[PDB]
Amino acid sequence: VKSCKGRCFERTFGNCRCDAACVELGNCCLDYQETCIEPEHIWTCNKFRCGEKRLTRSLCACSDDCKDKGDCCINYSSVCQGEKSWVEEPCESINEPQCPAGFETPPTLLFSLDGFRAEYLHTWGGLLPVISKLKKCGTYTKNMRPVYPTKTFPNHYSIVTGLYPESHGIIDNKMYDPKMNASFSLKSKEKFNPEWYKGEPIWVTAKYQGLKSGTFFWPGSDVEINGIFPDIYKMYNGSVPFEERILAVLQWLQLPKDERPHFYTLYLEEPDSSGHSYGPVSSEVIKALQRVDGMVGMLMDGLKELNLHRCLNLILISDHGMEQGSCKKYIYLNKYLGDVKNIKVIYGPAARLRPSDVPDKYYSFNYEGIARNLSCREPNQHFKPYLKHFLPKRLHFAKSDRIEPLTFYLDPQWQLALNPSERKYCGSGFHGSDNVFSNMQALFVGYGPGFKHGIEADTFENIEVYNLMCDLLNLTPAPNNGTHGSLNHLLKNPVYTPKHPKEVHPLVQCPFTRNPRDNLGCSCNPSILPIEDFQTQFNLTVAEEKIIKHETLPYGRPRVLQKENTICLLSQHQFMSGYSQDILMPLWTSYTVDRNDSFSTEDFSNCLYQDFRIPLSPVHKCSFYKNNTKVSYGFLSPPQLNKNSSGIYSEALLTTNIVPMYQSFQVIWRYFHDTLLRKYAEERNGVNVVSGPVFDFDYDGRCDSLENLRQKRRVIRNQEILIPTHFFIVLTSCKDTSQTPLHCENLDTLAFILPHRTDNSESCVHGKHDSSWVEELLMLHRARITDVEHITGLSFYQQRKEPVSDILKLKTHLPTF
Ligand SMILES: *[C@@H]1O[C@H](CO)[C@@H](O[C@@H]2O[C@H](CO)[C@@H](O[C@H]3O[C@H](CO)[C@@H](O)[C@H](O[C@H]4O[C@H](CO)[C@@H](O)[C@H](O)[C@@H]4O)[C@@H]3O)[C@H](O)[C@H]2NC(C)=O)[C@H](O)[C@H]1NC(C)=O
Ligand SMILES: *[C@@H]1O[C@H](CO)[C@@H](O[C@@H]2O[C@H](CO)[C@@H](O[C@@H]3O[C@H](CO)[C@@H](O)[C@H](O)[C@@H]3O)[C@H](O)[C@H]2NC(C)=O)[C@H](O)[C@H]1NC(C)=O
Ligand SMILES: *[C@@H]1O[C@H](CO)[C@@H](O[C@@H]2O[C@H](CO)[C@@H](O)[C@H](O)[C@H]2NC(C)=O)[C@H](O)[C@H]1NC(C)=O
Ligand SMILES: COC1=C(OC)Cc2c(ncnc2N2CCC(CNS(N)(=O)=O)CC2)C1
Ligand SMILES: *[C@@H]1O[C@H](CO)[C@@H](O)[C@H](O)[C@H]1NC(C)=O
Ligand SMILES: [Ca+2]
Ligand SMILES: [Zn+2]
């Protein structure tokens, strides 16, 4: 008589009513809405609904007969039978999977929350119980590094291909390809054009090895790629309620085994939507985080109902983070260029510039003009123009023709457009910035049989996830930019054991040859003590050699993986090196700076000693470089460094230890070796160094072939010389600063791929002290050891006692400060 329970929509005698007319009259029973209406609009049971008379319009049932008819709401057992929800159960380990027939290989589900910045879980974890329990019981990293630009289509497509955007071709939501003379838009028919989507998404990889796939939304899953769609896919429709997407994937997981997928995707637009609309710190984002947390709960609760919660491997992930934009932190190019109508500028933090007249002027247009026009125009300028090949190599953002030849690097929180007309609300949340900025860092949680429990893994890159998902599905990965085995530490039972790459030809020898003590045109500083008997000073005892190797190559010698290549090892007291007869230059030197080693200020300009182990060549003489305006030289192993005296190490002045070096770059090189290397040595109680030249004329992140390099020599004073595109440096100390680099239990690395440029316009040297800008340029141009390996054709640390997987982990690390 007081309640609608069991009498929805029926006439009553006893006071309160349960028909739609009651609301106007305000004579409804107090539980009319909860009992009779809400069930049409909600996917949950509650205390009002437990044992409800079945309603025909209800989205799911909480009626006693719901289990028989198999349409109980997912939380039925939790709420109406008093059982515990997935989130309410304590963690318990999944050593053996408990899977049905068909899942002898257990399924993997890639669940994306768009624009879930890593920080959201750091800060609001107390409000996110489900994602928090997955972290607790699973494999988590505080930060998963996205690809540049930190945008949705690029990162989603990267996750499922293991490719950098420059390689997979989806470099933004809006693109122009000049070869195609077509434009890419998400609003357009070209969105569906397979020409745009390169590489191999995992759903294709899986199909070729006989696994079916179900994608409830993912970029590319609605495109015929290598002639294939996912076995089940959905046309993107953001209006589909989240509950309906999760319920559909749970339907797919009950398909008969012959047609049931192994690889699944789930995607939600939150918290990216709220993040843009109201900012990353906002009531709206908190509410969205709680919503997606609940949807993750609905999935886990559903998997429990299906006895699949100790079967399915879940990867909960995000494309990128989110940052607070400001109208006071937006740069307009028209301030510097005027209201010109010949250029189209892509707005935001990953801003790019292209001529209007395309494809005609795309290559011919004067990029360098605008580049210099916009450089160092203000002090503490919040943007920097870059020809795409001069962007830090760590960003891997240049190979694709779809990348405009002039790009901008924006500071944290800063964005750029041509003018205020061509951009949306500047006060909005945004992303797209440098993929090492904290607020761009992304979510990763792995949970399931395949993944470890209660592990917090060090930061890794989303490009490594493709190989990981391949391992979880026992697939052979297509070729990608992940280092296979670098994430073996995340897996209970790694399926791929990596091996160090095998050197193609063993080292040729460079034996001493009796030759004249020839004139090099050098006016040596008198202090320097020349090499009085070369054959004496460089005929070393096997006892003497063991000591040198142990001090200079404590991790083994860099191995060379290039096919057509001839290198020779050169021995010295303070350093070892690999010399290329082919390019008249070392590919690498290795030396070790100890805590209390001495760095000399004594000048050593215009001083070289001939090396009788290689033929003398014109480019090895001080004469070639004397008042040469076009190129100078520099030393890999530093002459400044003496272990024996406080003077200058003469052996470092050999012709074999010099590389072509622009005068401008000497400022950087001299500051590094004089100042920084000393500080690094003191700070870390010794540091092993390996440095060398880099030739990437294709700007493709890879060492150029010898064949290619022959056509890229410059002719200077009627000599053929090869000038490095970059110089690499790899510092190595111990995690424990008590031990020196020769006896590390654990390696701490720091590597650089410094661009080799004829001016230092990059750094805006004007009215600034020298110290500041060099350190900043090194930090911007840091790189993974793996980045160095790719671009030099070298392979480091091959003689370490550590297993290979642990080395790959170390090699793929990028330091962040
Ligand atoms: C990230 O991973 C990617 C995959 O491992 C790497 O990209 C691959 O780079 C190679 C080197 O260019 C490229 O392979 C090809 O080599 C030929 C050049 O010698 C190229 O022409 C070949 O392709 C083809 O030739 C015809 C006519 O030109 C083409 O129409 C056809 O495509 C035919 O197969 C050959 O494929 C790959 O193209 C490329 N893959 C992708 C998807 O980009 C990156 O090197 C790597 N990046 C880093 C920094 O590690
Ligand atoms: C994109 O997804 C949205 C949300 O799922 C779709 O809109 C919804 O469409 C349904 C039916 O497709 C509508 O429901 C009702 O359908 C019955 C059909 O018999 C009809 O009697 C009702 O009057 C009502 O129309 C619903 O109104 C609609 N919106 C909401 C709020 O759920 C949409 O169809 C999808 N497709 C595209 C491409 O937009
Ligand atoms: C490249 O694409 C541009 C833009 O689509 C082409 O310009 C079009 O030319 C056609 C006929 O050739 C005209 O009917 C259109 O009105 C033009 N569109 C626009 C917006 O200008 C251009 O001709 C294409 N081909 C090449 C290789 O330049
Ligand atoms: C099925 O594959 C597709 C998708 O898989 C997810 C997404 C998508 C597609 N086409 C156009 N736009 C798309 N979206 C990406 C970005 C996405 C954030 N917008 S938000 N967070 O404001 O609501 C909203 C638009 C196709
Ligand atoms: C840069 O060129 C523009 C034309 O786009 C011109 O308005 C401006 O004066 C130039 N700025 C300079 C010379 O730095
Ligand atoms: Ca190259
Ligand atoms: Zn977004």
Q: What is the CA–CA distance across the termini?
A: 68 Å
Bound heterogens, unique: a molecule of 4 linked components (NAG-NAG-MAN-MAN), a molecule of 3 linked components (NAG-NAG-BMA), a molecule of 2 linked components (NAG-NAG), the ligand COC1=C(OC)Cc2c(ncnc2N2CCC(CNS(N)(=O)=O)CC2)C1, 2-acetamido-2-deoxy-beta-D-glucopyranose, calcium ion, zinc ion
Major sheet summary line: 8 strands, mixed
What form results from the Cα inertia axes?
Answer: elongated
Order of the strands making up the biggest sheet: 7-6-8-1-9-18-2-19
**CATH topology title of the largest domain:** Extracellular Endonuclease, Chain A
Give the helix/strand class: alpha+beta
By CATH, the architecture of the largest domain is named 3-Layer(aba) Sandwich
* Radius of gyration over all CA atoms, rounded: 32 Å
> What is the CATH superfamily classification of the largest domain?
Extracellular Endonuclease, subunit A
Give the helix proportion (percent range): 10-25%
What is the number of beta strands? 35
**How many separate helices?**
23
CATH class of the largest domain: Alpha Beta
What share of the residues does DSSP label as strand, in percent?
15-25%
The domain count comes to 4
PDB class: hydrolase/hydrolase inhibitor
Keywords: human E-NPP 1, drug discovery, inhibitors, HYDROLASE-HYDROLASE INHIBITOR complex
Assembly: monomeric
Entry title: Crystal structures of human E-NPP 1: bound to N-{[1-(6,7-dimethoxy-5,8-dihydroquinazolin-4-yl)piperidin-4-yl]methyl}sulfuric diamide
